[PDB]
Amino acid sequence: MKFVYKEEHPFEKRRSEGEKIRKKYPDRVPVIVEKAPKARIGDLDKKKYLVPSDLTVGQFYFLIRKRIHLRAEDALFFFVNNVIPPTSATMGQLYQEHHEEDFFLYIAYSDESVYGL
Amino acid sequence: DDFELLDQSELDQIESELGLT
Numbered sequence: 001m002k003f004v005y006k007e008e009h010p011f012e013k014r015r016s017e018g019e020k021i022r023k024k025y026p027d028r029v030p031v032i033v034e035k036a037p038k039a040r041i042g043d044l045d046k047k048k049y050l051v052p053s054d055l056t057v058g059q060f061y062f063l064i065r066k067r068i069h070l071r072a073e074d075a076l077f078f079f080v081n082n083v084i085p086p087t088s089a090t091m092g093q094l095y096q097e098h099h100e101e102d103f104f105l106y107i108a109y110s111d112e113s114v115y116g117l
Numbered sequence: 118d119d120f121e122l123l124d125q126s127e128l129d130q131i132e133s134e135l136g137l138t
Contacts, residue, residue, distance in 0.1 A: 021120065030120065048120045055125060062131070063123050 001082055001115060003106055005032050005047055011102060018103025021050070029053050029095040029105060033064065036079065036110035038117055042068035044109075053092030057085050064109065079108045079115045 006014070021030050028050040035043055044067060051060060057078065065076060077084055080098050095105045108115060 025122075028122065046119075046121050050120045050122050052123070052125060055123070059125070059128050060123075062128055066127070 001079065001106065001108055002037075003032065003034050003108070005034065005106075014102035014104060022103050025050050027053050029091055029099075030103065031091065031095070031105040031107055033107050033109065036108040036112075036116055039110035039112065041074055041076070041109075041111045042070060044068055051091045053090060053095065055091045056087065057089045057091065057094065058087035060091055061087065075111050075113070077110055077113055079110065080106065082115050084113070 018030060031049050031051055032047050033044060033049060034047060035041070044064070046067075061076065061078065064078075070076060079085075080094060085094055091105075099105050110116070
């Protein structure tokens with residue numbers, strides 16, 4: 001999966017901020033959230049989120065919906081490394097396994113059940 | 118700070134209202 005944040009902010013500066021932020025905020029994981037390519041739903045103003053590690057994916061859905069113009073007829077799916085993480089996983093679990101080496105977790109959203117369609 | 122902190126407090130009452138156990 002490809003994200004604008006990575007293209008705009010170069011690695012060693014991201015990894016810089018990841019290390020910093022992960023040490024100030026206990027029990028809060030840093031995650032970047034971008035609209036997927038080809039997705040047709042509301043854009044998200046802010047990308048950079050600190051999320052309680054014990055917060056479920058299920059709940060993270062609720063919090064992101066709250067922040068985009070989403071009609072009821074619109075579907076919404078998260079993607080981590082091209083795969084939909086289950087609603088039962090914790091943002092903590094998700095960070096542990098799939099955090100990249102800048103210490104960030106990258107999640108894309110879309111209205112299509114398959115990334116980038 | 119460019120980071121937005123999400124807190125469960127937003128959800129907490131909702132979950133009660135919808136009947137979470």
